Design an enzyme around this catalytic site. Structure first.
Site, PDB file in Angstrom:
ATOM      1  N   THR A  26      -1.200  12.214   0.940  1.00  0.00           N
ATOM      2  CA  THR A  26      -0.111  12.804   0.287  1.00  0.00           C
ATOM      3  C   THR A  26      -0.774  13.860  -0.431  1.00  0.00           C
ATOM      4  O   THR A  26      -1.283  14.058  -0.723  1.00  0.00           O
ATOM      5  CB  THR A  26       0.349  11.834  -0.682  1.00  0.00           C
ATOM      6  OG1 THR A  26       1.036  12.487  -1.068  1.00  0.00           O
ATOM      7  CG2 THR A  26      -0.409  12.130  -2.268  1.00  0.00           C
ATOM      8  N   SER A  45       2.806   7.624   0.320  1.00  0.00           N
ATOM      9  CA  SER A  45       3.409   8.835  -0.435  1.00  0.00           C
ATOM     10  C   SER A  45       4.661   9.554   0.067  1.00  0.00           C
ATOM     11  O   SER A  45       5.782   9.535   0.588  1.00  0.00           O
ATOM     12  CB  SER A  45       1.995   9.063  -1.638  1.00  0.00           C
ATOM     13  OG  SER A  45       2.834   9.911  -2.498  1.00  0.00           O
ATOM     14  N   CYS A  46       3.900  10.929  -0.183  1.00  0.00           N
ATOM     15  CA  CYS A  46       4.501  11.802   0.856  1.00  0.00           C
ATOM     16  C   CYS A  46       4.592  11.302   2.342  1.00  0.00           C
ATOM     17  O   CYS A  46       5.378  12.231   2.715  1.00  0.00           O
ATOM     18  CB  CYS A  46       4.817  13.115   0.359  1.00  0.00           C
ATOM     19  SG  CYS A  46       4.766  13.781  -2.072  1.00  0.00           S
ATOM     20  N   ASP A  88       3.885   0.231  -9.192  1.00  0.00           N
ATOM     21  CA  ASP A  88       4.100   1.441  -9.066  1.00  0.00           C
ATOM     22  C   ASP A  88       4.631   1.927 -10.332  1.00  0.00           C
ATOM     23  O   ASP A  88       5.999   2.304 -10.021  1.00  0.00           O
ATOM     24  CB  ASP A  88       4.282   1.859  -7.332  1.00  0.00           C
ATOM     25  CG  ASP A  88       4.016   3.492  -7.034  1.00  0.00           C
ATOM     26  OD1 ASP A  88       4.257   4.349  -8.315  1.00  0.00           O
ATOM     27  OD2 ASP A  88       3.829   3.533  -5.790  1.00  0.00           O
ATOM     28  N   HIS A  91      -0.103   2.818  -7.943  1.00  0.00           N
ATOM     29  CA  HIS A  91       0.860   3.710  -6.747  1.00  0.00           C
ATOM     30  C   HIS A  91      -0.886   3.299  -5.906  1.00  0.00           C
ATOM     31  O   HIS A  91      -0.407   3.428  -4.278  1.00  0.00           O
ATOM     32  CB  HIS A  91       0.842   4.635  -7.383  1.00  0.00           C
ATOM     33  CG  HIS A  91       1.636   5.813  -6.058  1.00  0.00           C
ATOM     34  ND1 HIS A  91       2.373   5.649  -4.962  1.00  0.00           N
ATOM     35  CD2 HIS A  91       0.847   7.136  -6.037  1.00  0.00           C
ATOM     36  CE1 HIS A  91       2.329   6.658  -4.845  1.00  0.00           C
ATOM     37  NE2 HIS A  91       1.614   7.604  -5.222  1.00  0.00           N
TER      38      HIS A  91
END
Lengths: 262, 258, 258, 262
Positions: B11, B80-81, B208, B236
Site C-alpha cells: 500500500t 489496503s489502498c 483491523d 491490519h
C-alpha cells in the site's frame, strides 16, 4: 464597394511529436499584422511536462486546447490552425466548443469528416504514405488495456519528407526538440464519429502544397474530394512545413481567413 | 495443489518489504512470487513529487504486466489502498489476470468514481492521528496531498499486533505516499470489461484497527466479491500477523483460478 | 583546417535548441557537434525539483564524457552559467577535454568557492526584472531556489538583438532552472589538476545586456584565460546574433587545441 | 564489591548496500534494556534519497553519521556499533568527534588502523575473500574525475555468505531493500590516514564469529592481531549478520560495553 479587413485570434496547433515551437516564425508574422496569436503545446509535446505513456487517447492529448477553449471569454471566438495530424484536434475541439470557433484552418492536415470513423483519414494517409523510413515504434498499454503505438520520427524522414526545403537551422532545431508521439489510431477507430452539429458546422479552410513530401498530392486531393472545404488555398512550392517555408504566404492566407470568418 | 504466480502489491508509503514473510511462505508451497515496489515506494528511486496520479504510481505493476509472457496469468494480491492498483491494472490487462485478491483493502467498483472507497474509508476513519501532510502541485496544476504516516498510527492502527522487529522495520523504511484522491475523483470509472470481469477474493480480519469492521462489511455489501475469507485475530497486516493463514487462503485462490 | 568534436552546453532554463544555428555552421566546416540538454532543460524529461545540485544538473554532460571512446577529446563550449558545467566536467574528465570555451559565460576559478562568479554576476546584475522565483527543499534538506526567466528580461537582456523568430522560439521552449548557488557555496573548490589544467578561451561582446562589460572584464582579470576573443556587436546570445563569428573563433580553437 | 550497570546511547551503522533496517531486531532488543538507540541510513543506503552516483567518497557517504554527531547535545557521548564496512564510518567519525564517542564497537567489521592507509583492511579483506560470486559491478566518474566502482551484491552471495543462517523472512527482506554500494577503495587509498588523536584514542570492542562466511576467521584474526582491540567478544555460531542471528547475545555484549565505557 465596401472592403473589410479583420484582426483575429488564431490558436495554432502543432502535429504529434512536435510542439508550439514550429510556429515560432508564423506567430510573429501574424502578430506583425495585429492579430492575437496563441500557440499551445498539446499533452506530452514541446515542453509539456507529461510523457506520452500517461496519455490514453487523442482526446486526452488535445486537453491543452480544450482547457484553453474552456477558458475563453464569453463571446470570444478563435480561428484554430492545425498542421498535419492536428485536424483531429480541431475536430475534437469543435464537437465541444463549436460556439467558440470562427473557422478551422487545416494546414497540410488531416481533414476529418463526420461520415466515417475518426481514424479514417489516418488510415488513408498510411495507405498513401506507408513507409516512415527510419521512424522507430514502441507501445505501451493504456488505462483500459489498449496497446498504443508511439513513434520517434526518424531524422531522414524529418530531413527529407517533413522538412524538405527548410533551413538547416530549422531542421537542426527540429532534431533538438522533437519528442515521441501517437496517432492513437486504434482508440480513434473505437471513437464516436465527429458530429455534424459541432465539427460538421465549423467553417473549414484547406491550405496545402503539392510539394509536400509526406502528405502527398494524391492524399491531399482525395481529402478535399472526400470532404469539401469551404475554401482551398494551394501554396506554390515550399514543403510540408509551410509555416517555416512559406511563413509570409501562410500569414496572408490567414489574414484572408480572418477577413472572411473572424 | 495448483501452483500459481502471485504479484504482491504493497500500500502507499510501504514497499515490497511488507511481503517479506508472505513471499517465502508462498514459495514453500511451490508458487512463483513477484513483489514489486510501486513508484516512490520501498526502494524505488523516484520521489512522490514526480508522481502525478495513482495510475502513474501503478507503473511498476503495469510494466511487469506489460511484459508478462503471452499466455501467463497472475493472481494480484493488494493490501489496503492497493485495491486501486488492482483495478487500474485489471482495466489494462484483464486477460493476464487470473484473479485479484484484496487483503484488508479498498474494493473499488464500476458504478461510482475511482475515489469512492477512499471517500468512504476516510468517513469511517477520519483521524489519522500523528500523520503529517504536505502538498505539491503536479504537472498539470493539481495540488496533490502527500502524507507521512505517524508512528503511533503505525504502532496502534496498522501494525497493531505486529512484532517489535516488524514495527521497527516499518519505521525504518516507510516513505511518503499519496492517495491522489482528487485525481481519482476526476478519473474515469473502472470498466466492466476490465476490472468488472476479474474474479475477486476479499480477505480481512474484524480486528483491523484502521479498515474497521463496518467499513469492510460496507465494501463487501457495496460490491460483493466472489469469495470472502475472514481470518480470526491478527491486525491490519495479516501478511505479518497471520502469514500462514493468508498463504493458505492464497492456495485456495490458486486452486480455484489456476 | 583541424576538424574537432565540440560539445555545446546551454545555460540554465534553456536547452540544446539555442545551438540550432551554431551546430550546422560548425558542421559546414567539417566539425562533429554534440549539443546536450542538461537535466530538466530543453526536452530532458526530468523536472527541476528532482535535481539537487549543479553537479547533478551536469549529468547529461558527465555521462557523455564518461562514454567518450578512449583517446577521443572534445572542446566543450558553454554559454552563460555553463562555465560551471565546464568546470565540474573538467575536474572529472580532464584528459578528455582539449579545451573549454566560455561564450558570455561565467569563468569559475580554483581559489574561491564554486559560487564565487554567481555572486559577482548578481552584484553586477541584481535585478532580473520580471523573472519569477520559487523554492523546493532538495533531498538533503537544502532550499533550492528556482526561477522562471521573465520575457522582458528575455527580450531586452538576453535576446536583445535576436530575431523575432528566435525570441519567439525562446519563449516557446524555456523552462525553469536554478543556480543551486547555496549548494555551490558549500561545494569543494575546482581542482588545479582538473579544471585548473584545461586550456580556456573566453568569447564575449561588450554589447551583452546581462553579463555586462565590467563584469566580463572583471572575470578575465580574475582568472586570465589563454585566449579572449571579443566579437563586435551581437548581444548575449552570440550563437544566434553572431553565429558565423563564433563558428570562426571555434575553428581557431580546433586548430590550436586539436 | 561494587557492581555497575549503565544505560547508553548506541548509534548503529549499517554496511554499504544495506540500511538502518538490518538493525530492526537489535534496536528493540537494546531498547528493552532501557538504552537509547539511533539507527542511521548512510548516504544512498536504506531509504536515503540520494543515489550512489552522487556520492564521491566514503566520507561523503558517512555524512548522516557526522551530521548526527554534529547535532549531539553538549556532553552527550554515544557508542557507535558498525557492521562489516562500517568500521570505516567509525574511523571517519572519531577523527571529527572523538569528543562524543564513548567507544566504537566493530561487529564482524573492518577494523581500520592509524598505521596504514584507510583502504588497507579493505585490501586485505579482498585478498582474503576475492570472489563475490554473483555480485555485479559498475562504475561512475566522481566530482574530481576518479572512477568509482559500485556493486549490486548477488543474491547467492547474500544467501550463502552474508545471511547464511538467517531466517527466510530476513533473507527475503534483504533482497527487497538492498541497494548499490561502494567501497570507494581508490579514494580511501588517497585519503589521509586516520589520526591517533581521534580514531587512535577511541575505545574499541571487536565482536565476531568464526562462523562468518564472508569476513572469514583468518581475516578477522589478522585484524585483531594487526590492531589490538580493547576487548574481543567471539559469539559462538550465527553467521555474518549476528544482529539477526544472535540478536540477544549481541545485545548482552553491548550492555557490557555500556557498563565498561558509557
Amino acid at each position: 464597394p465596401i472592403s473589410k479587413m479583420v484582426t483575429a485570434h488564431f490558436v495554432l496547433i502543432h502535429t504529434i511529436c512536435h510542439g508550439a515551437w514550429i510556429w515560432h516564425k508564423l506567430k510573429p508574422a501574424l502578430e506583425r499584422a495585429g492579430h492575437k496569436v496563441t500557440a499551445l503545446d498539446m499533452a506530452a509535446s514541446g515542453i509539456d511536462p507529461r510523457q506520452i505513456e500517461q496519455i490514453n487517447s487523442f482526446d486526452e492529448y488535445s486537453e491543452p486546447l480544450l482547457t484553453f477553449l474552456e477558458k475563453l471569454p464569453q463571446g470570444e471566438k478563435v480561428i484554430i490552425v492545425g498542421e498535419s495530424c492536428a485536424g483531429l484536434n480541431i475536430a475534437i475541439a469543435a464537437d465541444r466548443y463549436v460556439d467558440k470557433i470562427a473557422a478551422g484552418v487545416f494546414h497540410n492536415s488531416l481533414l476529418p469528416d463526420t461520415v466515417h470513423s475518426p481514424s479514417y483519414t489516418v488510415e488513408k494517409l498510411l495507405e498513401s504514405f506507408p513507409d516512415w523510413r527510419d521512424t522507430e515504434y514502441f507501445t505501451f498499454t493504456n488505462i483500459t488495456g489498449e496497446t498504443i503505438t508511439t513513434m520517434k520520427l526518424g531524422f531522414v524522414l524529418l530531413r527529407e519528407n517533413l522538412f524538405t526545403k527548410c533551413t538547416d537551422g530549422e531542421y537542426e532545431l527540429a532534431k533538438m526538440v522533437m519528442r515521441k508521439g501517437s496517432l492513437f489510431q486504434n482508440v480513434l477507430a473505437q471513437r464516436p464519429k465527429f458530429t455534424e452539429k459541432g465539427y460538421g458546422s465549423i467553417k473549414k479552410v484547406y491550405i496545402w502544397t503539392d510539394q509536400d513530401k509526406i502528405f502527398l498530392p494524391d492524399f491531399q486531393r482525395w481529402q478535399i474530394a472526400n470532404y469539401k472545404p469551404d475554401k482551398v488555398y494551394q501554396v506554390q512550392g515550399g514543403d510540408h512545413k509551410l509555416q517555416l517555408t512559406k511563413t509570409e504566404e501562410v500569414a496572408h492566407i490567414l489574414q484572408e481567413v480572418a477577413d472572411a470568418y473572424a
